[PDB]
Amino acid sequence: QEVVIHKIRINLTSTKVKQLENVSANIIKNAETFKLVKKGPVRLPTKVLKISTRKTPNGEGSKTWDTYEMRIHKRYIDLEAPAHIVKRITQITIEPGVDVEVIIAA
Amino acid sequence: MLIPKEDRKKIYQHLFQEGVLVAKKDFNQPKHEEIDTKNLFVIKALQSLTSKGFVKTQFSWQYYYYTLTEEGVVYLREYLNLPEHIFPATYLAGQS
Amino acid sequence: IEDALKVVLRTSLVHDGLARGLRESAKALTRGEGQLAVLVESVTEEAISKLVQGLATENVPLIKVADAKQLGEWAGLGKIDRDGNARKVVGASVVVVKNWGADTQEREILLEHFSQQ
Amino acid sequence: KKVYTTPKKIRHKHKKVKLAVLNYYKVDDEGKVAKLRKECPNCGPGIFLANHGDRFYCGKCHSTFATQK
Amino acid sequence: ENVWYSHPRKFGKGSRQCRISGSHSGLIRKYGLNIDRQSFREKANDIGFYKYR
Numbered sequence: 509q510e511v512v513i514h515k516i517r518i519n520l521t522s523t524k525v526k527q528l529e530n531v532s533a534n535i536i537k538n539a540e541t542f543k544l545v546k547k548g549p550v551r552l553p554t555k556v557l558k559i560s561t562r563k564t565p566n567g568e569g570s571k572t573w574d575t576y577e578m579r580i581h582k583r584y585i586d587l588e589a590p591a592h593i594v595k596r597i598t599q600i601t602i603e604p605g606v607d608v609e610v611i612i613a614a
Numbered sequence: 615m616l617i618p619k620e621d622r623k624k625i626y627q628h629l630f631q632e633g634v635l636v637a638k639k640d641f642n643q644p645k646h647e648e649i650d651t652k653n654l655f656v657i658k659a660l661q662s663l664t665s666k667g668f669v670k671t672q673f674s675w676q677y678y679y680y681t682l683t684e685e686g687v688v689y690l691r692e693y694l695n696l697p698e699h700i701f702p703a704t705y706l707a708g709q710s
Numbered sequence: 711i712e713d714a715l716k717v718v719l720r721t722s723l724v725h726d727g728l729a730r731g732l733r734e735s736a737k738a739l740t741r742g743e744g745q746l747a748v749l750v751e752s753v754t755e756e757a758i759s760k761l762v763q764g765l766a767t768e769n770v771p772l773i774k775v776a777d778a779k780q781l782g783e784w785a786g787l788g789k790i791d792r793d794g795n796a797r798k799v800v801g802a803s804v805v806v807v808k809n810w811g812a813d814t815q816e817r818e819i820l821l822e823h824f825s826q827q
Numbered sequence: 828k829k830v831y832t833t834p835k836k837i838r839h840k841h842k843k844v845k846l847a848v849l850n851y852y853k854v855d856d857e858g859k860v861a862k863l864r865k866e867c868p869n870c871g872p873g874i875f876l877a878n879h880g881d882r883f884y885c886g887k888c889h890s891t892f893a894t895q896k
Numbered sequence: 897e898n899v900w901y902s903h904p905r906k907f908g909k910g911s912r913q914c915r916i917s918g919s920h921s922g923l924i925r926k927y928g929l930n931i932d933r934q935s936f937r938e939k940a941n942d943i944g945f946y947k948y949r
């Protein structure tokens with residue numbers, strides 16, 4: 509028995525979009541079932557990680573460049589919710605690829 | 615390589631305790647992690663140990679991957695005397 | 711006969727404390743470090759032995775006796791590999807024990823026989 | 828590859844210098860053991876010092892110790 | 897053991913060092929990878945970089 513509202517930000521990080529989407533859906537479902545105050549899954553400017561590299565390992569040949577890129581998806585959620593139960597909720601359901609990060613503040 | 619004997623002994627003990635040894639190809643550097651000795655000596659010792667069977671070796675991403683066989687373990691024990699039933703981690707203790 | 715000999719040597723080996731030779735022995739003797747010294751009664755010159763004895767007198771107790779090679783074999787000097795010996799030959803010269811290890815046996819009994827009659 | 832380089836001058840390494848030693852820790856004829864020369868107090872009495880010529884110098888803590896007399 | 901065997905290797909090519917082979921040429925330090933270009937080429941699909949554009 510505690511019952512104290514946190515007002516907490518939860519940030520996700522994913523290289524894979526589908527997994528992230530699934531996680532978001534799961535979170536929304538959880539919010540629905542427990543009836544909690546939320547700010548609906550907010551997207552960010554997706555950082556594209558570009559590494560420009562000459563494809564040639566020797567240099568002898570024509571000037572060929574390849575920009576090996578990794579598009580990284582953030583997507584965060586804001587939950588205005590209670591304590592222990594909320595914490596329990598914000599731990600379960602893990603998809604391979606996506607990383608879930610829950611911060612603090614009461 | 616000639617290593618100060620006590621240091622070598624310490625290294626061996628550490629290995630026994632672990633059942634696992636690293637030490638990267640980062641030569642010349644002051645000190646290895648966990649074991650407080652110069653790395654080159656350690657590496658040489660490991661190589662010597664390997665030479666007759668005993669340990670395993672992989673050079674991947676300059677790391678060195680040292681793990682002993684049971685015969686090797688026995689030999690190590692003999693080298694450092696040590697009474698019966700002192701375990702590395704090959705002998706299972708936890709639950710997974 | 712003599713339980714605090716081979717066993718004591720083994721214990722010393724385990725914990726590093728066999729100051730084998732002359733200089734090492736002397737070092738061991740100079741402070742309260744060398745608990746028990748084994749020398750050879752039948753060696754060349756004997757002046758060295760006398761010196762060792764003097765140093766011990768300055769802990770003191772000494773086990774005398776001869777048989778150098780046997781003592782060397784007991785102590786472990788060279789390459790073992792198999793089970794026993796596997797060397798050419800090695801004597802004792804002067805061995806000073808700095809360790810003790812496990813008690814029981816004839817640890818204090820030999821000492822009693824020697825120092826304390 | 829370009830071959831041969833000879834600017835001369837060659838040496839071994841260093842001698843062990845064997846001897847029989849132990850003239851130090853000198854003995855009186857059954858009674859007292861005597862300490863020859865000098866021995867370091869900063870490292871522990873018994874650890875012998877080396878005498879050269881207006882210098883007394885340790886081996887265990889080599890560059891650390893120097894004494895004049 | 898020698899206290900005369902190594903001078904400062906602080907930057908440039910010293911501490912700025914490879915994390916695969918032990919080379920120094922062509923070191924992409926972007927996002928702290930420290931991988932050689934060629935090696936990266938044959939591995940980037942596993943690290944997570946692709947040929948999208």
Ligand SMILES: [Zn+2]
Pocket residue numbers: 867869870885887888889891892
């Ligand atoms: Zn000194």
